[PDB]
């Protein structure tokens, strides 16, 4: 599925050598029980991402119809990514880009702080997610460091989804980073980083591809080599987590990257 | 402390008597452990009202400085009421009126539904609360039925307070009632009920008191007896949870009830 900043976020995770520690699993079990209880109150969905083994534990409540998951996708309990992949597919493509930007800023910030301090922070936003009838509804999303390892590395990351009290439209996902103790709520302005997911050269190449030019025509019109065009094309496929150029075109348009 | 609708809300609670039931305390204990684990994630405050014994179990996290509590007031874990008075005092007085109106509508709706259905609803709002430095900040507040008794009565009500991601001012507390499984968020319009907490005759009587008229003089101007004036006065004191007519005038002004 289309996505952004996957490489960059994995790089932040790679700054903590969590997978090298001998960790107690009973801690993860206690958190899994808490998250099931919480979903029984909010009627939503919880994901616990475990950096020690790169696995996700997903809990979906029967009342979480706003996710629009199929019977088979709801039956999941353990995903093999740091992301709950079929939940992400349900997010409006424009909102997914902003979510990714907030997560990257949030993890950059929290991973470079002390273990005790990083726990006082929370990243939040309000996303559009599509239900079973293809209608977008507004969902409150939380990202938060839940547990650290004894040696101070990030161990568990907590993600939460629930139907928001606010169903009114507004431009963007109103991303925020909150420091709970100091009572500080920082609003993120994501517009400029969004416009820069793709470089200007990558955007030109994609507009040519969409228009119907061949590598040879693109090289002719942008005064670059066919080798270079194909280097950019392949970079774009990686940046947008898609498999071919027609897929890249649809992703760029849906996510409003051009 | 000044408040509204305390009699009306207590009457709603009284519609679900449970004295005849022998209830399992182990159930309450599990909810208390959950609510503690939750506050350790949202850095906030949880109140569980137990309608069976009319006690409240209050948990305040150390990072919940947005509450403005003093050290002694935070130490509290079992309040002897259906609500902890030290929390409500911190709520902006105008926001308090709307909060009670939402709760009253929420309870009236839920207490008339089946045990299974009433669990699918959430009452939410965004309140102003005064912190340790005397500044108002925005707090997300939740009211939800958490547990019914075997015979079908409301047993435990769950309230939650945490620092909102939205710190932008707006007219009112944006009170909502959400049906989680149907994905339905109903916005409440509370202005007409707010203006009707006091009757027109009760408002007239309070203006005279503020103006300095005695009961005898109020009786002459309105052409009613002193017995009648004094019954209205006592009714007003009860409606506003205050002890005298000076406190009543001040409360009506601060809560914008005149
Ligand atoms: Cl829905
Ligand atoms: Cl928002
Ligand atoms: Cl604060
Ligand atoms: Cl006299
Ligand atoms: Cl009379």
Are B162 and B42 in contact by the 8 Å Cβ rule? The answer is yes
Cβ-contact A110, A125 below 8 angstroms:
no
For residue A183, the CA-to-ligand 3 centroid distance in Å is: 4
Gap from B240 CA to chain A (nearest CA, Å): 29
* Residue A224: exposure state from Cβ atoms within 10 A (0-12, 13-18, ≥19): middle
Distance, CA B87 to ligand 3 centroid (Å)? Answer: 14
CB-nearest partner of A183 from B37, B131, B166? B131
Q: Where in chain B is the domain with CATH 1.10.10.10?
A: 195-258
- Beta carbons of B176 and B124 less than 8 angstroms apart: yes
How many CB atoms within 10 Å of residue A116? 9
| Pick from B76, B79, B92, B186: nearest CA to B139 | B92
> Taking a C-beta distance cutoff of 8 angstroms, is the pair B97, B252 a contact?
no
Query: How far is the C-alpha of B248 from the C-alpha of B258, rounded, in Å?
Result: 11
User: Given an 8 Å threshold on Cβ–Cβ distance, is A180 in contact with B165?
Assistant: no
Crossing angle (nearest 10°) for helices A200-211 and A215-222: 130
Q: Out of A137, A146, A185, name the one closest to residue B165 (CB).
A: A185
User: Is B119 in a helix, a strand, or coil?
Assistant: coil
Whether the CB-CB separation of B21 and B148 falls below 8 Å is answered with no
> Is the Cβ pair A183, B65 closer than 8 Å?
yes
Q: Which two tokens stand for residue B10?
A: 């207590």
What is the fold of A1-194?
Beta-Lactamase (3.30.450)
Closest listed residue to residue A232, CA positions, set A201, A208, A256, A254: A201
Question: What's the reported resolution, in angstroms, to a tenth?
Answer: 2.0
CA dihedral B237, B241, B247, B253 (to 10 degrees): -90
List, in order, residues 6 or more apart from B75 with CB less than 8 Å away.
none
Query: Residue B227 corresponds to which tokens in the numbers above?
Result: 């017995």
DSSP B186: E
Taking each helix axis from N to C end, the angle separating B245-254 and B226-239, rounded to the nearest 10 degrees, works out to 50
B195-258 belongs to CATH 1.10.10.10: yes
Distance CA B108, CA B11 (A): 10
Centre of ligand 2 to C-alpha A125, Å, is 7
Q: DSSP string of A190-208?
A: -HHHHTTSS-HHHHHHHHH
How buried is B88 (Cβ within 10 angstroms: 0-12 exposed, 13-18 middle, 19+ buried)? Answer: middle
- Torsion angle in degrees (nearest 10) through CA of A69, A70, A75, A80: -60
B184: closest chain A residue by CA: A163
- The number of CA neighbours under 13 Å toward the Cβ of B81 is 10
Count Cβ neighbours within 10 Å for each residue of B165-184 and write b for 16 or more, e otherwise. bbeeeeebbbbbbbbbbebe
Cβ contact A183–B163 (<8 Å): yes
Q: Do B176 and A165 touch (CB under 8 A)?
A: yes
Q: Where are the beta strands (DSSP E) in A63-218?
A: 78-79, 121-130, 136-148, 154-163, 176-179, 184-187
Best of A128, A165, A186 to disrupt the B interface (most B CBs within 10 Å) is: A165
HSE (side-chain half, CA atoms, 13 Å) at A175:
20
Inter-chain contact B38–A38, Cβ cutoff 8 Å? yes
CATH 3.30.450.20 segments of chain B: 1-194
CB B18 within 8 A of CB B51: yes
Q: Count CB atoms within 10 A of the CB of residue A222.
A: 16
If phi > 0 it is left, if psi is from -120 to 50 it is alpha, else beta; for residue B137 that is beta
Radius of gyration of chain B (CA): 20
């Amino acid at each position: 599925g289309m996505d952004v900043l996957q490489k960059e976020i994995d790089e932040v995770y790679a700054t903590h050598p969590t997978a090298h520690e001998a960790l107690d699993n009973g801690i993860v079990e206690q958190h899994q029980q808490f998250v099931r209880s919480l979903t029984e109150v909010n009627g939503g969905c919880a994901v616990i991402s475990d950096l020690s083994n790169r696995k996700s534990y997903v809990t979906v409540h029967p009342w979480a119809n706003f996710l629009g998951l199929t019977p088979e996708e709801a039956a999941l309990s353990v995903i093999d990514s740091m992301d709950e992949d079929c939940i992400y597919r349900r997010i409006h493509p424009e909102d997914l880009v902003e979510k990714r930007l907030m997560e990257y800023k949030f993890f950059q910030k929290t991973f470079s702080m002390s273990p005790g301090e990083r726990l006082k922070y929370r990243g939040r936003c309000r996303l559009r997610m599509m239900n079973e009838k293809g209608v977008y509804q507004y969902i409150d999303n939380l990202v938060q460091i839940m547990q650290n390892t004894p040696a101070g590395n990030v161990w568990l990351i907590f993600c939460l989804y629930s139907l928001s009290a606010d169903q009114r439209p507004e431009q963007g996902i109103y991303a925020t980073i909150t420091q709970m103790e100091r009572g500080e709520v920082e609003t993120l302005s994501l517009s400029e980083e969004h416009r820069n997911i793709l470089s200007e050269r990558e955007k030109e190449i994609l507009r040519c591809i969409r228009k119907g030019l061949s590598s040879k025509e693109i090289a002719a019109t942008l005064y670059i080599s066919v080798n270079t065009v194909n280097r950019h094309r392949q970079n774009i496929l990686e940046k947008l987590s898609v498999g071919n150029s027609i897929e890249a075109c649809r992703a760029a348009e849906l996510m409003k990257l051009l």
